[PDB]
């Protein structure tokens, strides 16, 4: 029997046991150049910035393959066990501060100033060293499948030919998933800039030549599954801080109906009229940052209230709040400088980010009735395989032929090579956090446990340090 | 909507009406009447925008309208007037004027383009509602609306 | 803008997007029963209860300027004395939107 | 104060990279993560923190560079130089937010009802540790004595 | 035009759950309570 | 059995797809991409459409 | 009940004056104060005190 055509909310075929676990990852550090990958000798230095979505793959310990000391644990063929997140608490350990980014030679001809001298015709170069504060924001989202982002790119132009060399490219929206080293949105529209900046002077040096993603919340709210995100939080403030002008030649100026000519002036306008502002993040606080705050998930926003299908979790956490760069200065000779030279001290540039992950998973048995079993076919192709419900034909009942010393020339060559099977997410890559062992059952022991039981009412430690003032 | 002055400027037009001598006190070697225009308009400033201030993506449950019409789609039609300059940020571009990546940096080689893009979505929770057609109520609509 | 013989709508961040959401007439629909309103007694319509306009784009501030604006001087105390207006005094002007 | 925490003594060989008061001294920070993990909880009964900051200027170091942006990032110009020579480090100056009569966390009795550890305030070893720091109250005091009396 | 992109299954769409949630008939209540 | 919604991976409505305004503008991509939406089967042949 | 309704676009009020009386300001790198000339007035912008 295969009747159903519309999705059923995951609670209906999912039994929730009353068991809890605590999965705490040991603190993670990574350090490196803020802007681009560096290369000393024959080794590298990961370009670790404060504007990249750290995307963790929290791989779980398969539930259905655990220890059952009793007969009460689900019958071997009726039901299957999985994981269900209840609490998540991403901890960010670093000194608070603002993120800055700049570029050696930026493209800014002039700004919003009234007493500044008149605009000199653009010289061969007008670039200058540019400071540009990060557009502060914070994003956290937990789910089953990797989060999806959107961006702008150039869509193939049509056969119709009215083309020129400097003609502007058509644009179009595109989706993608968010991987480990992607770019956060800093003040400019999202796009694989690689095909938009042919000038190399249009972006802050760290962001340039890399793709700026964004959370396609719209898409996430539409998926039946909801696997995209269990829940999520975002806080971001920005505002213009200066106003600048590009320095490129113009292929389209304002017609004479907008621009009124003047004496001894020029018929058409020549200096480009693009006014993009530079965005500076609002002052960051001890209360605004969304972290170290346990998130109790009580109902997801989808038909999937936190079921770790495929014994897998995806944590997409990004914030430029914590990050501040770290400068260094080594003597170019190894001996403290006796005098102050501009050549003696080499300026180095290292920045470092640290996380921690804590989950309060619970055990939950899904029934395996003909109907519910079936149902998952359309919900997901892959999690069925974990169940092993599907049949695999008895073809080991075909007699193939083994040989001894398959090496001997007279004997068969055995040239053919078996190909290793691919993983579901092997093309894309992201931080891989294994939790198969760093999992437990004693809630009281850990930090997030007391924090849990406290709210529960079963507390040896209630979260209250009441302050009156 | 928040705003506030950020600079203060002055127009540059000739004046057909200056402040009379009862306001402007002349000075030595100065001029009898004032000639430079005295218009002081400030430049509008949009203050920092937040993740909480923007009014969107927030379902609006309409329980009672502010008129005698609590949400009736008369004429099977709706009008949504939505405007905000919050989301928008312009997008710059730079194509080489020849089609080949520039080997050297010229002020003439890269053409600056301008492209900005806006995206919406609309969602409604309409309900069915039957209007009676009694001589009295029927009539009534004559003055409420000619067309429906 | 105008390239060739085609156009490019001037899409700004400062324009009231006004949608006409045209509905499906609720009076001409399939009635599989009798309790459905009698044919001549009454007519059905629509009534909105909920609306949720979703805006999908990266947050940020809107800027606008002009090639040659008309601004002679500002509110500064140490700026040199006002030169008689020359033939032109316009300059390139940045001007952030009034959010 | 605005810069990462480190015994700068081995990081600033230039003597021009820190504010004179902080230089040559170690910048610590509260390792909240560690404190929340100790079974005892002896590390902290409770605690409060309030701190605001934001960039106020953006500057550039002045050191010679051992690593510039490759040609794939920096596009050369006419009569320009093959490789970039002026350093490209952009650190912002830390800015302290305006302080209020309400924001400061003091003079406010803290009633401890349940600690965050298995130790709800037991002075083991008849000892207590109070770690209190804030740059809010402080303002320097100038003076001027005549060089002759 | 919305003449066809109109339905009757509240549960299916994003704004539906968001609706039923408030209603009390919920498969998905809008609560991700955060304590701090 | 398909349009009727009896058996399918996801609701047609649930999926979110792009749609532009003024798709003829050179800013935008060409009309050929329009084919991605489910396509009427008898499109090769043609006849009076009432 | 009273309900005063104000119909106009929001914004800030500015006011100035052709020749205001301001010799100098709170600046540290500004040149030294020149003896007051016959006139020191200048065109002055001054935003209202909302």
CSV table of C-alpha atoms in Angstrom, one decimal, chain D residues 10-148:
chain,number,residue,atom,x,y,z
D,10,UNK,CA,58.0,38.6,22.0
D,11,UNK,CA,55.6,40.1,19.5
D,12,UNK,CA,56.6,43.7,19.5
D,13,UNK,CA,60.2,43.9,18.6
D,14,UNK,CA,59.5,47.4,17.3
D,15,UNK,CA,58.3,49.1,20.4
D,16,UNK,CA,55.9,51.1,18.2
D,17,UNK,CA,53.1,48.6,18.2
D,18,UNK,CA,51.3,49.2,21.5
D,19,UNK,CA,49.9,51.9,23.7
D,20,UNK,CA,52.8,52.8,26.0
D,21,UNK,CA,51.1,51.6,29.2
D,22,UNK,CA,50.2,48.1,27.8
D,23,UNK,CA,53.5,47.4,26.0
D,24,UNK,CA,56.0,44.9,27.3
D,25,UNK,CA,53.3,43.5,29.5
D,26,UNK,CA,50.9,40.6,29.2
D,27,UNK,CA,47.2,41.0,28.1
D,28,UNK,CA,45.0,38.4,29.6
D,29,UNK,CA,41.4,37.5,29.1
D,30,UNK,CA,38.7,35.5,30.9
D,31,UNK,CA,38.8,32.0,29.6
D,32,UNK,CA,35.1,31.5,30.3
D,33,UNK,CA,35.2,28.2,28.4
D,34,UNK,CA,37.7,26.8,30.9
D,35,UNK,CA,35.8,28.1,33.9
D,36,UNK,CA,32.5,26.5,32.7
D,37,UNK,CA,34.2,23.1,32.4
D,38,UNK,CA,35.8,22.5,35.8
D,39,UNK,CA,33.8,20.1,37.9
D,40,UNK,CA,34.5,22.0,41.1
D,41,UNK,CA,33.4,25.3,39.7
D,42,UNK,CA,35.9,26.7,42.2
D,43,UNK,CA,37.1,28.9,39.4
D,44,UNK,CA,34.0,31.2,39.6
D,45,UNK,CA,30.8,31.2,41.8
D,46,UNK,CA,29.2,33.7,39.4
D,47,UNK,CA,30.4,36.6,37.3
D,48,UNK,CA,29.3,39.6,35.2
D,49,UNK,CA,30.7,41.3,32.2
D,50,UNK,CA,29.7,44.4,30.1
D,51,UNK,CA,31.9,45.7,27.4
D,52,UNK,CA,31.3,47.7,24.3
D,53,UNK,CA,33.7,48.7,21.6
D,54,UNK,CA,33.9,49.6,18.0
D,55,UNK,CA,36.4,50.9,15.5
D,56,UNK,CA,37.1,54.6,15.5
D,57,UNK,CA,39.9,55.1,13.0
D,58,UNK,CA,41.7,52.7,10.8
D,59,UNK,CA,45.5,52.7,10.5
D,60,UNK,CA,48.4,51.0,8.9
D,61,UNK,CA,51.6,49.6,10.4
D,62,UNK,CA,54.9,50.8,8.9
D,63,UNK,CA,57.0,47.7,8.6
D,64,UNK,CA,58.8,46.2,5.6
D,65,UNK,CA,56.8,43.3,4.1
D,66,UNK,CA,58.0,39.7,3.8
D,67,UNK,CA,54.7,38.8,2.1
D,68,UNK,CA,52.8,41.0,-0.3
D,69,UNK,CA,49.6,40.2,-2.2
D,70,UNK,CA,50.4,38.1,-5.3
D,71,UNK,CA,49.9,39.5,-8.8
D,72,UNK,CA,46.6,37.7,-8.8
D,73,UNK,CA,45.3,40.4,-6.3
D,74,UNK,CA,47.3,43.5,-7.1
D,75,UNK,CA,47.1,44.8,-10.6
D,76,UNK,CA,50.2,46.8,-11.6
D,77,UNK,CA,50.1,50.3,-13.2
D,78,UNK,CA,52.2,52.4,-15.6
D,79,UNK,CA,55.6,53.3,-14.3
D,80,UNK,CA,54.6,51.4,-11.2
D,81,UNK,CA,56.5,48.7,-9.4
D,82,UNK,CA,56.4,44.9,-10.0
D,83,UNK,CA,55.8,44.0,-6.4
D,84,UNK,CA,54.0,46.0,-3.7
D,85,UNK,CA,56.4,47.5,-1.0
D,86,UNK,CA,54.3,49.6,1.4
D,87,UNK,CA,52.9,47.2,4.2
D,88,UNK,CA,49.2,46.4,4.1
D,89,UNK,CA,48.1,45.8,7.6
D,90,UNK,CA,44.9,47.6,8.6
D,91,UNK,CA,44.3,47.5,12.4
D,92,UNK,CA,41.6,49.7,13.8
D,93,UNK,CA,41.9,51.7,17.0
D,94,UNK,CA,39.7,50.4,19.7
D,95,UNK,CA,36.9,52.7,20.8
D,96,UNK,CA,35.2,52.8,24.2
D,97,UNK,CA,31.5,53.4,24.2
D,98,UNK,CA,30.0,56.2,26.2
D,99,UNK,CA,29.7,55.1,29.8
D,100,UNK,CA,26.6,55.6,31.9
D,101,UNK,CA,25.3,55.7,35.5
D,102,UNK,CA,23.3,52.6,34.9
D,103,UNK,CA,25.7,50.5,32.8
D,104,UNK,CA,28.4,50.2,35.4
D,105,UNK,CA,28.0,46.9,37.3
D,106,UNK,CA,28.8,48.0,40.9
D,107,UNK,CA,27.6,49.1,44.2
D,108,UNK,CA,24.8,46.6,43.3
D,109,UNK,CA,24.6,43.8,45.9
D,110,UNK,CA,24.8,40.4,44.2
D,111,UNK,CA,22.7,37.8,45.9
D,112,UNK,CA,24.1,34.4,44.9
D,113,UNK,CA,21.4,31.8,45.0
D,114,UNK,CA,22.8,29.0,43.0
D,115,UNK,CA,26.3,28.9,41.5
D,116,UNK,CA,27.0,27.5,38.0
D,117,UNK,CA,29.1,24.5,39.2
D,118,UNK,CA,28.6,21.9,41.9
D,119,UNK,CA,29.9,24.4,44.4
D,120,UNK,CA,27.3,26.9,45.4
D,121,UNK,CA,29.7,29.3,47.2
D,122,UNK,CA,31.7,27.2,49.7
D,123,UNK,CA,34.8,28.9,50.9
D,124,UNK,CA,36.9,25.8,50.8
D,125,UNK,CA,40.2,26.5,52.6
D,126,UNK,CA,38.7,29.6,54.2
D,127,UNK,CA,39.6,31.6,51.1
D,128,UNK,CA,38.0,33.8,48.5
D,129,UNK,CA,39.1,35.3,45.2
D,130,UNK,CA,37.7,38.4,43.9
D,131,UNK,CA,38.7,39.3,40.4
D,132,UNK,CA,37.4,42.8,39.6
D,133,UNK,CA,38.4,44.9,36.7
D,134,UNK,CA,36.8,47.9,34.9
D,135,UNK,CA,38.2,50.8,33.1
D,136,UNK,CA,35.0,52.7,33.6
D,137,UNK,CA,35.7,54.7,36.8
D,138,UNK,CA,39.3,55.6,35.9
D,139,UNK,CA,40.4,59.0,34.6
D,140,UNK,CA,44.0,60.2,34.8
D,141,UNK,CA,45.1,63.1,36.9
D,142,UNK,CA,47.5,65.8,35.7
D,143,UNK,CA,49.6,68.1,37.8
D,144,UNK,CA,52.0,71.0,37.2
D,145,UNK,CA,54.7,72.0,39.6
D,146,UNK,CA,56.9,75.0,39.0
D,147,UNK,CA,60.5,73.9,38.2
D,148,UNK,CA,61.8,76.3,40.8
